Ligand binder design. Sequence first.
Ligand SMILES: CCCCC/C=C/C/C=C\C/C=C\C/C=C\CCCC(=O)O[C@H](COC(=O)CCCCCCCCCCCCCCCCC)COP(=O)(O)O[C@@H]1[C@H](O)[C@@H](O)[C@H](OP(=O)(O)O)[C@@H](O)[C@H]1O
Ligand SMILES: CCCCCCCCCCCCCCCCCC(=O)OC[C@@H](COP(=O)(O)OC[C@@H](N)C(=O)O)OC(=O)CCCCCCCCCCCCCCC
Ligand SMILES: *[C@@H]1O[C@H](CO)[C@@H](O[C@@H]2O[C@H](CO)[C@@H](O[C@@H]3O[C@H](CO)[C@@H](O)[C@H](O)[C@@H]3O)[C@H](O)[C@H]2NC(C)=O)[C@H](O)[C@H]1NC(C)=O
Ligand SMILES: *[C@@H]1O[C@H](CO)[C@@H](O[C@@H]2O[C@H](CO)[C@@H](O)[C@H](O)[C@H]2NC(C)=O)[C@H](O)[C@H]1NC(C)=O
Ligand SMILES: *[C@@H]1O[C@H](CO)[C@@H](O)[C@H](O)[C@H]1NC(C)=O
Ligand code: ALF
Ligand SMILES: [Mg+2]
Lengths: 350, 1064
Amino acid sequence: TSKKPPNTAFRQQRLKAWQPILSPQSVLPLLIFVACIFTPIGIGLIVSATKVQDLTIDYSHCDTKASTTAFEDIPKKYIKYHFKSKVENKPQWRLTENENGEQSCELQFEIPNDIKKSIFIYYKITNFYQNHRRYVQSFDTKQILGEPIKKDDLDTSCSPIRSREDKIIYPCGLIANSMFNDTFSQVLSGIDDTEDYNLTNKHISWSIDRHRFKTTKYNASDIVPPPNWMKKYPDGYTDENLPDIHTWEEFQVWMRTAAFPKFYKLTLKNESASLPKGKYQMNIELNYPISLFGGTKSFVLTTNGAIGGRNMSLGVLYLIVAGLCALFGIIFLVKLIFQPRAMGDHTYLN
Amino acid sequence: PRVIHINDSLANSSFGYSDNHISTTKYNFATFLPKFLFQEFSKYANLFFLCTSAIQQVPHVSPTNRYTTIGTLLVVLIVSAMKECIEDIKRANSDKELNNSTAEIFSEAHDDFVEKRWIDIRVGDIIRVKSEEPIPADTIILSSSEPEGLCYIETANLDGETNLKIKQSRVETAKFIDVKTLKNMNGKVVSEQPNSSLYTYEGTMTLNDRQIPLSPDQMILRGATLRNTAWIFGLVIFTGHETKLLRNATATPIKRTAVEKIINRQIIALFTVLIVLILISSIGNVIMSTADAKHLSYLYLEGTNKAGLFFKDFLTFWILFSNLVPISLFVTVELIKYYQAFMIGSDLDLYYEKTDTPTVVRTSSLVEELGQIEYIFSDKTGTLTRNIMEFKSCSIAGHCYIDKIPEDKTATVEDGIEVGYRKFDDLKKKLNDPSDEDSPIINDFLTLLATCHTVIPEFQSDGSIKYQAASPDEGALVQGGADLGYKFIIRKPNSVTVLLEETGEEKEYQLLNICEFNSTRKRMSAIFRFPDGSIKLFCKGADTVILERLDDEANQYVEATMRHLEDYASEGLRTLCLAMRDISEGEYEEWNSIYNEAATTLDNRAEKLDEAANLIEKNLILIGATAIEDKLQDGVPETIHTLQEAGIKIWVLTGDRQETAINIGMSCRLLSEDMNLLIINEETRDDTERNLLEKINALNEHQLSTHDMNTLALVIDGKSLGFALEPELEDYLLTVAKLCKAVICCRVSPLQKALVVKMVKRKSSSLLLAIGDGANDVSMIQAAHVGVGISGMEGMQAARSADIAVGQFKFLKKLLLVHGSWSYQRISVAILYSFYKNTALYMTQFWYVFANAFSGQSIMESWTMSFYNLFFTVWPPFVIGVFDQFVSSRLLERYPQLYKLGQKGQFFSVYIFWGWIINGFFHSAIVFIGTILIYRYGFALNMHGELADHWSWGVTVYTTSVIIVLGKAALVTNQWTKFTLIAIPGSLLFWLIFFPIYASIFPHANISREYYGVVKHTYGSGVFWLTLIVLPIFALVRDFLWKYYKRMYEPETYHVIQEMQKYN
Ligand SMILES: CCCCC/C=C/C/C=C\C/C=C\C/C=C\CCCC(=O)O[C@H](COC(=O)CCCCCCCCCCCCCCCCC)COP(=O)(O)O[C@@H]1[C@H](O)[C@@H](O)[C@H](OP(=O)(O)O)[C@@H](O)[C@H]1O
Ligand SMILES: CCCCCCCCCCCCCCCCCC(=O)OC[C@@H](COP(=O)(O)OC[C@@H](N)C(=O)O)OC(=O)CCCCCCCCCCCCCCC
Ligand SMILES: *[C@@H]1O[C@H](CO)[C@@H](O[C@@H]2O[C@H](CO)[C@@H](O[C@@H]3O[C@H](CO)[C@@H](O)[C@H](O)[C@@H]3O)[C@H](O)[C@H]2NC(C)=O)[C@H](O)[C@H]1NC(C)=O
Ligand SMILES: *[C@@H]1O[C@H](CO)[C@@H](O[C@@H]2O[C@H](CO)[C@@H](O)[C@H](O)[C@H]2NC(C)=O)[C@H](O)[C@H]1NC(C)=O
Ligand SMILES: *[C@@H]1O[C@H](CO)[C@@H](O)[C@H](O)[C@H]1NC(C)=O
Ligand code: ALF
Ligand SMILES: [Mg+2]
């Protein structure tokens, strides 16, 4: 017995096993348990999503539709809101224009109840492909850290926006070249005995972006702004116009690309107190044109919930699963009771 | 007509004959790659991987690494190449070992026989073959050490049996004994062209001025082996690849299984689907880039050329979507098949502890066929029958004696004529005392046993004498007389010496004349002279010839012997009747002159001698009858019965004659007495055609009842099968063979054993298995879909040339019922699942091309997409295709009909494949839609207003897809051992512990710099956990409910068997 195979449970394929069987003695109780545990979760999630009160104003087309003189009411196809009470006066808007030609949109809305919760101010963009293949990778990760990268050592992913007139462009790529540059006034001006609501701009992007985004080490005589930053920095950078992208948190927020053509970007927030009921006003500088991409930029004022925002999809999916399980459990139970199988243990065709 | 000169080799070599060069190697160092790469890239997965790796090398199209696919391709190609090189080296070693044989050629220089090698033996070299050395080439014998050119040759290679074949030289050329006279003879031999028919030969040999004919009585083939002869002189006619042995052999073809032929068409379909997806995406991309030229100005689109962008997005989408045909599947299938072969060759119930030779699977890539076999072609001796014939019973003086008496009829009832069984001890007790009347008949019987034969004994160094008999029945009769006490010893010419162990005295008998055995006579007569000076005639033969020639007034035991031949024939044993007679001197002096009258007529010798002998067999006295059994292996009838219950047709191709094949078929319960045997023994083409027409016309006219169909068998002769395989008479033989229950083919050359298999596999679409032993059926093993060789025995040519090697026949049951079916149920699933878990992920990459303007952006990091098929989805396929048993072994052995579940292909086909693919598409779409609905505007986190992004969502998609495929794997398994418990939940825990570690270290090392804050924005949020809990259940509820319904209200056969196993 030299070449005799071993006599072990593994080698002989007789391991200790456990064969499960799908029996109505254990499948129907499983469906009952699923339908009993998924309906409370779905109800809780839908309640938590409904408990979120917010407001949204599509301030696009404020150039032509809004009135220059006095306030006119915004059309209904641009306003959305969800509060615990009714709104007596609908939001309105006005178009202010300075002497040099720069315009601004002044929105005037009303909060009917005290929102004893943290307030957040986002801007919403649509039909903007932040996830295009030619657009996600187009940025140099070394200049973000501040390293004075030479011209030849510059990444090729910025190929169209990579150096101009024999000068290096400091913010590489197309992600920084096309940046949303509409400025929200960092205060909600209260109108008629309404106190001002002071927002803030610090601590907005991820806690890791305030660690990788560091002040550049370049010198201004080497770098030149992108083609779409020339209006803010005419005739190139200087020793004072050079920005430090360590505290420029709007740049950090914009660089973190989104996954869908319709996305939010945090711009302002307040978490110290609530805003009581009353009429408020927000001024928005109109710099970024929507004819560049063909979408709709909007101002959004929200709060925070257990799942973030007002979204019913999670509770709806929980309820769909619970309902399907309960329905098929009832169907199988009645088919079992009114029509017994009676298959037989020794009933076979071999 | 091949003309050959006998002496001058340099004169006959001008025609350009062979040079005894044999070649069993396919590849050489000058054309190894141009053929290996051609046979490797003749598949479809190899071409697909080659195209993918060639396209992936350009820079601006690859989202993943460029060296992984081509690296694994080169690795597997190197493995296959080195395996092929090892096999070719194994073949070349045997070829060189056979080529380095020391021959003896008659050189004219030395004018004597020198010791050269088998190579350079040209046509015409008068060679000398010594005692037991094999024959170098096709040689016509000229002389031998025997007095009249006689010689014995074993033909275990060109046939299957070890019985000595008689050859003899012509009377005009059997006088050249010394070598110094060989230089005197001359002439020329006109022979036939090189053919493959073994038992036929024709030609002429012209010496000085007189010519002599030739016949297979003089032709010696290359596969023979001289025995019981000191030396023979042979003139070579055929050599090398022109001999009738190695001209019929064929090369080794490439064997493909049915699963491979289904996988090829599945790959074609998947390639068409891939082309459809690529075309759709590229058309969408170009249409969008042409239409929205104004709204896409923030991307700085070039727009210089349309083709310059189209023929690039084509490649990008190819590389993005080519994961539908992965290579991890094509390496895991090979690993699973190798591990399955290892598991098959590791079972105790397939281990033969007599020769200590367990079974070994020498080709794993065919184990999947072990579950879908429909025919079985088998050779008789060695596989079914052990080459051991045994004298079992004798019946003398109206009694009957065996050694091992069974207890069913040990009590001899003495119902008038004595019927029953008595011991050999009581035979020796009625032999010992002289007072009994039958003792002169008993010893005359035992001398007819120990003297009438033609066995050549030989001694060994141990002293145990081995008998070399030209027929195994005469050898079993000699051994039956030998273990009874009458040992047969040294045989000189014209006398026989017998050693008697009863008394201790050594007798001797003067052999006067023997008449040879004939199938027309079925007799054998031998007149002898005794130490008494008396002349006695001994005669053995069948009862149907000698029972006409008795004196019923003289003998008194005919009624006992005919009933003993009737209960002997009721067990299928071969029987012979023994007769004797004292003769006088005057009739012997006349019959000697009648025998020399038959010696005078050389014009007629087949007809004259035997009927000149029949002058003296006008009257005989019957002694009794004998019974020789041909014992089979253990478990042969049970395995035949089980394999016929499981729905497998069993044929028997053998090189023996017809009667012994029919007897073996009757003994192993493969045939029966009620089975109408359609025997076709015609000798010409038109006669075989007429016979086949008569058979088919008599069969199709009557109604084919189930009893008539079951009780019908076919028996073909080799000379008739040589015509029944022509393109014309092929369909007739095929349609008359499929109606029968068992087919037997007799006198079949090694080439026809493969021609029959080729015909059956061409004229049908069924899988074939051929089990055999020895070398003659090697060509058979090469032709069948699966080959099995009997190992543990001497001359294991089949065990080396076959795909599987077994100890004996009785294992072929468990190799096919359990290990055969299991395999087919395992690997099949292990393939389908491998086409599922892959698609169910990468199809997300398709549903995303509508959300990014048909760009081609992926939603996961390249390294994670690579680790998907390496660390988290590799163990379920192995634990499904190795350690999964859908039904127990004892229930597979008890219900053979379950084998048919794999015989018709009810586990792997195009329909179930498309079902799995569509289920993968459905799961992918569900995951994508649910994830994009939960993460609407990225506002899904409750951490101070911070939002998610691209990678924090791709991670959730990846985790959900992994959990879903693991749940599907858990639903597919039947039994949950330990490897299944740590292979499906184990991968989930592995990923859930590996992601936080990989995303909190490798970003610091500039390896996948996207996961810098994903751990906190995923593992630190509740929406991630809630999605992980609610989406896989939503995706698997349909499969759970359909499984419950299918197993409850519409079960299959194996479902019922599993329900039996679970409770009982
Ligand atoms: C809304 C949520 C819905 C949840 C509930 C829905 C229920 C109905 C779903 C679909 C309706 C359509 C058909 C339903 C009606 C019948 C289902 C036929 C089921 C069927 O035999 O074939 C199956 C394919 O299964 C799908 O292909 C299943 C997929 C069905 C096709 C769906 C169409 C996909 C098209 C792409 C969608 C893209 C969406 C568009 C998104 C675009 C976004 C841009 C095959 O896999 P299977 O594992 O079950 O095979 C079984 C099973 O393994 C087991 O019972 C048996 O072995 P054992 O007993 O020994 O274990 C085995 O012999 C076999 O019977
Ligand atoms: C935590 C405790 C447990 C930890 C265990 C961790 C698991 C260890 C890991 C054990 C796994 C054992 C092999 C099981 C299959 C492995 C995956 C595979 O083989 O797939 C090839 C390719 C993936 O290709 P793809 O994703 O399917 O598609 C194409 C896609 N890349 C594209 O861009 O197109 O992989 C690679 O290239 C890198 C690895 C090369 C391995 C080469 C084979 C080894 C042979 C080995 C042969 C060995 C000898 C065999 C004979 C004895
Ligand atoms: C805020 O962002 C928008 C969006 O990029 C900026 O608008 C773009 O500003 C650049 C810079 O001047 C303009 O480029 C110029 O275009 C004219 C042709 O109209 C060309 O002759 C100049 O040489 C220069 O290339 C660009 O047209 C303009 N619009 C678009 C759709 O790109 C805007 O300047 C930014 N404002 C601030 C204050 O940052
Ligand atoms: C959030 O908003 C509240 C309400 O405006 C801020 O509280 C007031 O902040 C201003 C500015 O310093 C003070 O003059 C007021 O006295 C504060 N209110 C009270 C009742 O004392 C709060 O500072 C804001 N938190 C931020 C911006 O982080
Ligand atoms: C509060 O709001 C007023 C008016 O908008 C502003 O002048 C003041 O600076 C704000 N407080 C702080 C601390 O910024
Ligand atoms: F052993 Al055989 F024909 F009987 F090859
Ligand atoms: Mg054999």
